[PDB]
Amino acid sequence: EYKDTLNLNTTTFSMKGNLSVNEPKTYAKWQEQQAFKRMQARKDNHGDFTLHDGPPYANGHLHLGHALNKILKDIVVKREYFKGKKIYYTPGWDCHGLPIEQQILERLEKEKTSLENPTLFREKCRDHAKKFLEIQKNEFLQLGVLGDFEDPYKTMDFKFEASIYRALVEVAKKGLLKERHKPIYWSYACESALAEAEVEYKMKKSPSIFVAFGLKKESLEKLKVKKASLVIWTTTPWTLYANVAIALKKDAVYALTQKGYLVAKALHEKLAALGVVDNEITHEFNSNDLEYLVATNPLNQRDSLVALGEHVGLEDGTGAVHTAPGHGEEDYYLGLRYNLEVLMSVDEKGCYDEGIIHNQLLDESYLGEHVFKAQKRIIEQLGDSLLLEQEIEHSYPHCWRTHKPVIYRATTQWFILMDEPFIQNDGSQKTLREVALDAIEKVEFVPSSGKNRLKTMIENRPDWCLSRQRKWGVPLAFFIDKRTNKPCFESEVLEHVANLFEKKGCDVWWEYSVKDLLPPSYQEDAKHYEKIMHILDVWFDSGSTFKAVLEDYHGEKGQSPSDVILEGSDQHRGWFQSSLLIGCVLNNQAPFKKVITHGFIVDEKGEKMSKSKGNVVSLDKLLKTHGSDVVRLWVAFNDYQNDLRVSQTFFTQTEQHYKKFRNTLKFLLANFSDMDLKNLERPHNFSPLDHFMLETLETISAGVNSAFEEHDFVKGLNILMAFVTNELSGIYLDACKDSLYCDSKNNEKRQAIQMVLLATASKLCYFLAPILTHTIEEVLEHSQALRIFLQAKDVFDLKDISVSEKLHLKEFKKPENFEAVLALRSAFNEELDRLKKEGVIKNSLECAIEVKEKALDENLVEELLMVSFVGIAKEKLSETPAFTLFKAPFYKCPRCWRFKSELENTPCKRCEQVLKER
């Protein structure tokens, strides 16, 4: 046996990753040695890159969605660092708001107690966010991500709360913060106003009723008919107490039925078929002639003005809209257009209050009843004025944290105005809506489709309600001047409060008196001021991160505008939008240059992950099972810009991708492990096959890099895998196995192959470093030849090398053209397959080939096809137009197993020299 006499060609780099054991040691090392602060400190940094982290809410353990987010940021940041740039990536945490406070509220009820005290209540919220900020930081680090995680930004930091307030101050001083009174989203479960980003639309069952409002005697007499009752359709009988008007479409025909029901003519066929009204039409009237008629509410006998709405629809309902200014936005403006009462007797908990008694809007038995529980009895009380009751299902707004359905209540709140012109920094005049639309156009969106998703929301969004009635957050810390009943926006007062917030935090706004919150110039008039006690929308907190992080640290944590932000698709409704609006107020532009949007983590069915249905695949279990580098590769190897379905069969296919990458690196390290390192200093004479591989390596390297530049990691990884699978393993390593294992260690041709393998292993390490960082760190740990070839202590010294300069290749060396011999190789391998089907021969080495086109260099044909002989022989095997196969007229060599030995069981001529070399 000659197996002892072959080159060993082994490496300590193991085949099995054993990731759940080795990865924790790597990530713990990067924290001990401060790898990120070392990345920033790299002395040859050239250029700058800023990724501004969007702060996840400081609540709960991380799920797979958080991991997808951070891993994608980690790939983008590591890509820029390995391109040679100074990077800025300070992660942050969203600590205020209902995402944290609602958990305190739910914990207190399960604990059977409560908490009136403001300071102590904010403390338990603050401690909850601190506890889960630290839990999430360590779970992020167990994914291999690198950022300033030991110095993250926190909205609960005193300096940060002061930065948020100073951002609000800028909004106020530009004339965009104004009080408004109108119906808005109201969550009775937390007794607070809401805006769109705090609202979740989902399907809900609801009553759907058609109600008859009889015309009063004088209106019947003015219309000259015996009976007439306008029919309204509504899904909210809880608002009927607050009716003041019935709205019709302007200049539209309304049909009067023989039973005396008045509806829009365009809808009579639907309503008659529904059995709401009868089928016979006696008269038709124009809605213009019906305006200012008066009807009688059948619920409380109150008057109802027949009015004309701006856009009454004739596709649904009846063409007659029950109008309640207290509980509808378009209802409110119509009530003001006709100067009607704003009836609103629903308190902050969604229950009828004493206003129904004083204004006789509803029977006293409804006092204290919740509006949704009272609807069954209201419908019964409608009597025979109820023409038809159905139950339907419609999309309905719910509170994002209490998950209860919201209502609308006419209330006075604070708003950022969208269509109010304000003075631009360049001296011009524009509305916030116009500025945001122009700022969107300067932002690159990845994918491009996310642009008009944000553009559409900006085109249609209303004024932004900022004021909330909760405790955990940054207060709208302004004083109302009782003398003028306006807010005080004088700079000395606002900066005095801001300085106090910066040193002490926002707790002082609840604790201190009015005079102690006022500057010295103002205490003599302390009696004339009252504190606003609303807190800011938590989406204003996160929308201000660019100012608190990028601007207030003067580029020490990144430049404003940032180069890249990267969040999930639900952030067009949220952080993307709130940051755009706040950035457009302060700087008149978006605080980001590029938006990368990724999809959501969904189950095997494509359904949303819920902590209830159990479709949640826990991140911890996923990491223990597959390892972080496989989860990272699963992210990069999949269509992250769309939703990602989680199934263990998809991670198995990813492990096969990781095994293939890892097995390839093990072969490379094993087959240049014995190369004398003074080979690195001298130029080599590379073969045609060597140059084909070096030129192919250069071609796919440009493709992988160009794809990774566009963040299309699937495309680049496919180019990498196909190269690894076809050109590298299938062709090159197959043809070099004889020289690597059977030629002398001193053979210049074997040494040249090892340089090619060394170059290939360098390129794979560079391109895989941002994705499989622990694995590439492991590779460099096990190869002294790789560490000296790349001049790298570890993975963080990786640079994109020039293969030409480090291998001393000639300029204007004409590229190889293997289009002919590779097609002959394909044709031979097909014919070789069928000869093995018959069982004639077992290997390519048993064959001799005579090619009919002598243009093909003989020894390259022998190398690529791994025939033992090129030319004529005795025993024909089969023939094609291109070649003839013969049985190799030699014995199999006992050492290299090639058919090149002239005598049985005797080493071939090459192996004899090697076996006796001194």
Ligand X SMILES: CC(C)[C@H](N)C(=O)OP(=O)(O)OC[C@H]1O[C@@H](n2cnc3c(N)ncnc32)[C@H](O)[C@@H]1O
Residues engaged in binding ligand X (CB under 6 A): 54-57, 65-66, 68-69, 94, 542, 567-568, 570-571, 574-575, 600-601, 609
Q: Which does 567 bind (CB under 5 to 8 A by kind): Zn ion, ligand X, none?
A: ligand X
CB of 672 to Zn ion, least distance (A): 22
CB of 744 to Zn ion, least distance (A): 12
Show the beta-strand stretches assigned E in 419-555: 421-423, 429-431, 444-446, 464-465, 467-468, 479-481, 486-487, 529-531, 535-536
Residue type at position 386? L
Q: Return d(Cα 492, Cα 738) in angstroms, integer.
A: 83
Q: Return d(Cα 822, Cα 825) in angstroms, integer.
A: 5
CB of 54 to ligand X, least distance (A): 4
The nearer residue to ligand X, 567 or 629, going by C-beta atoms, is 567
Q: Return d(Cα 370, Cα 515) in angstroms, integer.
A: 41
CB of 739 to Zn ion, least distance (A): 12
Phi then psi for residue 596, to 5 deg, are: -105, 120
The nearer residue to ligand X, 62 or 867, going by C-beta atoms, is 62
- Measured CA angle at 794 (ends 791, 795), to 5 deg: 100
The nearer residue to ligand X, 148 or 816, going by C-beta atoms, is 148
Per-residue contact string for residues 379-398; x = within reach of Zn ion by CB under 5 A: --------------------
The nearer residue to ligand X, 65 or 91, going by C-beta atoms, is 65
Torsion angle (degrees, nearest 10) of CA 345, 348, 352, 357: -50
Q: Which does 475 bind (CB under 5 to 8 A by kind): ligand X, Zn ion, none?
A: none
Quickly list DSSP for 237-298. Answer: GGGGGG--EEEEETT-EEEEETTSEEEEGGGHHHHHHTTSS-S-EEEEEEGGGTTT-EEE-T
Per-residue contact string for residues 257-296; x = within reach of Zn ion by CB under 5 A: ----------------------------------------
Residue 682: CB partners within 8 Å, gap ≥ 6? 808
CB of 272 to ligand X, least distance (A): 48
CB of 39 to Zn ion, least distance (A): 50
Categorise residue 275: left if φ over 0, alpha if ψ from -120 to 50, beta otherwise: left
- Which of 108-116, 319-327, 576-584, 891-899 is the region at the interface with Zn ion (rule: CB under 5 A)? 891-899
| β-sheet bridge partners, residue 654 | none
Q: Which does 896 bind (CB under 5 to 8 A by kind): Zn ion, ligand X, none?
A: Zn ion
| β-sheet bridge partners, residue 408 | 185
Task: Give 593's DSSP letter.
Answer: S
Q: Which does 893 bind (CB under 5 to 8 A by kind): Zn ion, ligand X, none?
A: Zn ion
When asked if residue 888 is in the footprint of Zn ion (CB under 5 A), the reply is: no
Q: Which of 580, 619, 908, 914 binds Zn ion (CB under 5 A)?
A: 908
When asked if residue 517 is in the footprint of Zn ion (CB under 5 A), the reply is: no
Strand 294-296 and strand 153-154: the pairing is unpaired
The nearer residue to ligand X, 82 or 634, going by C-beta atoms, is 634
The nearer residue to ligand X, 150 or 570, going by C-beta atoms, is 570
Show the beta-strand stretches assigned E in 447-554: 464-465, 467-468, 479-481, 486-487, 529-531, 535-536
Which among 651, 897, 502 has a CA at the least distance from the CA of 910?
897
Q: Which does 662 bind (CB under 5 to 8 A by kind): ligand X, Zn ion, none?
A: none
When CB distances to ligand X are compared, the closest residue is: 568
Q: Return d(Cα 80, Cα 558) in angstroms, integer.
A: 14
The nearer residue to ligand X, 164 or 724, going by C-beta atoms, is 164
Q: Which does 600 bind (CB under 5 to 8 A by kind): ligand X, Zn ion, none?
A: ligand X
Q: Which does 561 bind (CB under 5 to 8 A by kind): Zn ion, ligand X, none?
A: none
CB of 610 to ligand X, least distance (A): 10
Q: Which of 176, 630, 693, 911 binds Zn ion (CB under 5 A)?
A: 911
CB of 817 to Zn ion, least distance (A): 31
Torsion angle (degrees, nearest 10) of CA 827, 831, 837, 843: -90
The nearer residue to ligand X, 547 or 662, going by C-beta atoms, is 547
| β-sheet bridge partners, residue 309 | 249
The nearer residue to ligand X, 198 or 863, going by C-beta atoms, is 198
Q: Which does 911 bind (CB under 5 to 8 A by kind): Zn ion, ligand X, none?
A: Zn ion
Asked if 129 and 156 count as a contact pair (C-beta separation under 8 A), the reply is yes
Per-residue contact string for residues 838-877; x = within reach of Zn ion by CB under 5 A: ----------------------------------------
The nearer residue to ligand X, 93 or 818, going by C-beta atoms, is 93
Q: Which does 601 bind (CB under 5 to 8 A by kind): Zn ion, ligand X, none?
A: ligand X
CB of 892 to Zn ion, least distance (A): 9
Q: Which does 635 bind (CB under 5 to 8 A by kind): Zn ion, ligand X, none?
A: none
Residue type at position 536? L
Q: Return d(Cα 395, Cα 406) in angstroms, integer.
A: 12
What is the per-residue burial (b if ≥16 Cβ within 10 Å, else e) of 624-652? eebbbbbbbbbbbbbebbebbebeeeebe
Q: Which of 125, 768, 895, 914 binds Zn ion (CB under 5 A)?
A: 895
Which among 575, 768, 552, 525 has a CA at the least distance from the CA of 665?
768
Q: Return d(Cα 474, Cα 533) in angstroms, integer.
A: 10
Q: Which does 509 bind (CB under 5 to 8 A by kind): ligand X, Zn ion, none?
A: none
When asked if residue 893 is in the footprint of Zn ion (CB under 5 A), the reply is: yes
The nearer residue to ligand X, 67 or 765, going by C-beta atoms, is 67
Q: Which of 95, 758, 896, 914 binds Zn ion (CB under 5 A)?
A: 896
CB of 442 to ligand X, least distance (A): 22
Q: Exposed (0-12), middle (13-18) or buried (19+): which is 508, by Cβ within 10 Å?
A: middle
Torsion angle (degrees, nearest 10) of CA 258, 261, 262, 264: -90
Asked if 325 and 244 count as a contact pair (C-beta separation under 8 A), the reply is yes
Asked if 467 and 423 count as a contact pair (C-beta separation under 8 A), the reply is no
| β-sheet bridge partners, residue 262 | 230, 256
Q: Return d(Cα 373, Cα 238) in angstroms, integer.
A: 9
The nearer residue to Zn ion, 374 or 893, going by C-beta atoms, is 893
The nearer residue to ligand X, 90 or 542, going by C-beta atoms, is 542
Q: Which does 895 bind (CB under 5 to 8 A by kind): Zn ion, ligand X, none?
A: Zn ion
Q: Return d(Cα 721, Cα 727) in angstroms, integer.
A: 10
Half-sphere CA count of 382, side-chain side, radius 13 A? 23
CB of 399 to ligand X, least distance (A): 15
When asked if residue 247 is in the footprint of Zn ion (CB under 5 A), the reply is: no
Q: How many residues bind Zn ion (CB under 5 A)?
A: 5
Asked if 271 and 297 count as a contact pair (C-beta separation under 8 A), the reply is no
CB of 1 to Zn ion, least distance (A): 13
CB of 899 to Zn ion, least distance (A): 10
The nearer residue to Zn ion, 592 or 890, going by C-beta atoms, is 890
The nearer residue to ligand X, 69 or 773, going by C-beta atoms, is 69
Q: Which does 908 bind (CB under 5 to 8 A by kind): ligand X, Zn ion, none?
A: Zn ion
Asked if 888 and 899 count as a contact pair (C-beta separation under 8 A), the reply is yes
The nearer residue to ligand X, 458 or 697, going by C-beta atoms, is 458
CB of 605 to ligand X, least distance (A): 14
Which among 716, 748, 754 has a CA at the least distance from the CA of 732?
754
The nearer residue to ligand X, 209 or 564, going by C-beta atoms, is 564
CB of 592 to ligand X, least distance (A): 13
Residues that bind Zn ion (CB under 5 A): 893, 895-896, 908, 911
